[PDB]
From a paper:
The P. falciparum Bromodomain Protein 1 (PfBDP1) has been shown to interact with acetylated lysine modifications on histone H3 to regulate the expression of invasion-related genes. Recent studies on PfBDP1 have shown that it is a multidomain protein with a predicted ankyrin repeat in the N-terminal region, and a bromodomain (BRD) near the C-terminus. Bromodomains are conserved reader domains that are known to recognize acetyllysine marks on the N-terminal tails of histone proteins. A crystal structure of the PfBDP1 bromodomain (PfBDP1-BRD) reveals it contains the conserved bromodomain fold, but our comparative analysis between the PfBDP1-BRD and human bromodomain families indicates it has a unique binding mechanism.
To structurally characterize the PfBDP1-BRD in complex with the histone H3K14ac ligand, an expression construct containing residues 333–456 was used for the crystallization trials. Protein crystals of PfBDP1-BRD (333–456) grown in complex with the H3K14ac ligand diffracted to 2.0 Å. The structure was solved by molecular replacement with a monomer of the PfBDP1 bromodomain in the asymmetric unit. Disappointingly, no electron density was observed for the histone H3K14ac ligand. However, the final structure of PfBDP1-BRD (333–456) protein possesses the conserved bromodomain fold consisting of four left-handed alpha helices. The end of the αZ helix encodes a ‘HIF’ shelf that forms the bottom of the binding pocket, and the long and variable ZA loop (358–378 aa) frames one side of the binding pocket before connecting to the αA helix. The αB helix is 19 aa shorter than the αC helix and is connected by a 3-residue long BC loop, which contains the conserved asparagine residue N413 that is involved in the coordination of the acetyllysine moiety. Like other bromodomains, the predicted acetyllysine binding pocket of PfBDP1-BRD (333–456) has a conserved asparagine residue (Asn413) responsible for making a hydrogen bond to the acetyllysine, while the gatekeeper residue valine (Val419) and the HIF shelf motif (res 354–356) are important for ligand binding specificity. However, instead of the WPF shelf residues found in the family II BET-BRDs, the PfBDP1-BRD has a HIF shelf that is only observed in the human family IV BRPF3-BRD. Thus, the PfBDP1-BRD appears to be a cross between two human bromodomain families by having the ‘wide’ acetyllysine binding pocket observed in the BET bromodomains, combined with the shelf motif from BRPF3, which has a ‘keyhole’ type pocket due to its large Phe gatekeeper residue.
Author numbering: 333 to 456
The structure:
């Protein structure tokens, strides 16, 4: 469990410091950012800081869950923001960075190990 938790903490940190990442660090303050419709659109809000809290609190039980929450950030981004907007472009770029970091760091190996383990349990 701890090997993938470490990787996730590094990776959330890599996202926070990546170009444009500050946009996804905190939850949108709908009034303060002039986004008054944001939570009428985004019903599952997520930010890097929420994910850091989940890691801090040991709330992830499987490595895929961390990836699912990060991907939710990017999915909310593309849903709320038009595809030709600066924010949507930034979110696509960070999404590519993240998915490639999953490869370079070998995080996807933990997810595939997750699956085969879950699958053998079923076959017992």
């Amino acid at each position: 469990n701890k090997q993938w938790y470490l990787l996730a903490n590094q990776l959330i940190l890599s996202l926070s410091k990546y170009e444009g990442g500050h946009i996804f660090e905190k939850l949108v303050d709908a009034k303060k950012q002039n986004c008054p419709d944001y939570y009428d659109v985004i019903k599952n809000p997520m930010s890097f800081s929420c994910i850091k809290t989940k890691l801090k609190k040991g709330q992830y039980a499987y490595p895929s869950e961390f990836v699912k929450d990060v991907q939710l950030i990017f999915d909310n981004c593309s849903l709320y923001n038009t595809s030709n907007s600066v924010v949507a472009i930034t979110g696509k770029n960070i999404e590519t960075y993240f998915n490639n970091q999953l490869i370079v760091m070998g995080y996807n190996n933990f997810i595939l190990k997750e699956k085969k383990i879950n699958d053998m349990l079923k076959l017992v």
